[PDB]
C-alpha cells in the first residue's frame, strides 16, 4: 500500500476547500415508498443520514437555500402514465391528515403537478428561519424548514406502487464558529448522546511507541 514514487510538486487551487464547494453537490436524503393510506408526509431533515450530519456539525451556525429533486419510478425501474402531486407545507401550516383532507386544496401550500413519464421535478426552497442562521446545537430549553406531502391525484386509489427518492443540493452556504468533529457513534437524531459504556479511541493503536 505505501509507494514511495510520484511526488507532486505544484500547489493546487484553494477553491476546492471553499465553503461553497464543500457542500456543492446533491445527495440523497430520503427514500419514500407508497405501496398499493395513499399519502406520505416527509418533513425536511438534514440529520437523517450519518453522512452530512457529521459534515454539518463541523460548524455551529449555517445559512443556506435548498434545491430538491424528486426522482420517481416504480419499485423496479418502470414508469407508467401517472399524475402526482408534491405539496410543500411551510413552517407553521397544518399537515394533511388523510388522503382527502381539505389541506390538499389549501392555496397557500404550493404544489407541483408532474407526470411519472416526465423529467424529475425541481424546487428551490429559500432560507426559512426566523433567526439569522440555522443552528444544530441549542443549549437552552424550548430549525424547521417544512414538510413535503406526496400523493397520487384522484378520488379513488391508483393500481400502482410508487417509490421516489429525494435529492437535495445546498446553495449559498455561509458557516460560522467551527467545532470538533464527531468521533463517537450516533444514538439519536436530536441530542448528541453517546454510549458511555465503551469509548472508541480516536486513533488506532500500535505495539510500542518506538515501532513506527
Amino acid at each position: 500500500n505505501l509507494i514511495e514514487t510520484r511526488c507532486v510538486l505544484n500547489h493546487h487551487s484553494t477553491q476546492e476547500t471553499a465553503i461553497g464547494n464543500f457542500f456543492s453537490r446533491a445527495g440523497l436524503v430520503s427514500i419514500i415508498t407508497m405501496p398499493t393510506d395513499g399519502y406520505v408526509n416527509w418533513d425536511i431533515d438534514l440529520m437523517g443520514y450519518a453522512q452530512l450530519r457529521r459534515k454539518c456539525e463541523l460548524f455551529t451556525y449555517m445559512r443556506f437555500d435548498a434545491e430538491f429533486t424528486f426522482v420517481v419510478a416504480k419499485p423496479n425501474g418502470v414508469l407508467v402514465p401517472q399524475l402526482l402531486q408534491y405539496m410543500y407545507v411551510p413552517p407553521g401550516a397544518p399537515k394533511p391528515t388523510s388522503r382527502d383532507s381539505f389541506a390538499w386544496q389549501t392555496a397557500t401550500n404550493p404544489s407541483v403537478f408532474v407526470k411519472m413519464t416526465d423529467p424529475p421535478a425541481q424546487v428551490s426552497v429559500p432560507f426559512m428561519s426566523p433567526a439569522s442562521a440555522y443552528q444544530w446545537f441549542y443549549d437552552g430549553y424550548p430549525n424547521m424548514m417544512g414538510t413535503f406531502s406526496i400523493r397520487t391525484v384522484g378520488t379513488e386509489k391508483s393500481p400502482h406502487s410508487i417509490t421516489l427518492r429525494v435529492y437535495m443540493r445546498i446553495k449559498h452556504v455561509r458557516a460560522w464558529i467551527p467545532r470538533p468533529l464527531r468521533n463517537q457513534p450516533y444514538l439519536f437524531k436530536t441530542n448528541p448522546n453517546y454510549k458511555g459504556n465503551d469509548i472508541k479511541c480516536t486513533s488506532t493503536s500500535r505495539d510500542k511507541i518506538t515501532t513506527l
Binding site: 505544484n10 493546487h12 487551487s13 477553491q15 476546492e16 464547494n21 456543492s24
Partner: peptide, 8 residues
C-alpha cells in the same frame, strides 16, 4: 465535475 481544477 464543475468544482475540479485540473493540473496546469
Amino acid at each position: 465535475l464543475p468544482g475540479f481544477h485540473p493540473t496546469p
